[PDB]
């Protein structure tokens, strides 16, 4: 419940492109969890504060 209430989503990657996005950029430090991200198509596109 707590994780769901603190979730995000990137519509950009819904296209399914395979490239530099959906990676753990280091500007994410202290803003989104570096470890909590789903598997499959959404790995790196769904991020948790």
């Amino acid at each position: 419940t707590l994780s769901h209430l603190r979730r995000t989503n990137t519509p950009i990657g819904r296209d399914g492109k395979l490239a530099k996005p959906r990676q753990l950029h280091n500007t994410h430090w202290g803003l989104v969890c570096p470890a909590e991200t789903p598997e499959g198509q959404a790995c790196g596109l769904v991020k948790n504060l």
């Binding site: 995000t8 989503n9 519509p11």
Partner: protein
């Protein structure tokens, strides 16, 4: 213990997932592919918020 940041709709409980987007009113300059007839383009998604 319930945090409560959600909606109750037709009984079911719904969560609005934070939809990530690129910021507006920022000047972004990026290179275009060499085969194209354009070298560099500066893009603004100007918006009166």
């Amino acid at each position: 213990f319930d945090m409560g940041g959600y909606f109750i709709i037709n009984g079911s409980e719904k969560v609005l997932i934070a939809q990530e987007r690129s910021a507006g009113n920022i000047v972004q300059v990026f290179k275009k592919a060499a085969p194209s007839p354009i070298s560099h383009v500066a893009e603004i998604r100007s918006a009166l918020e």
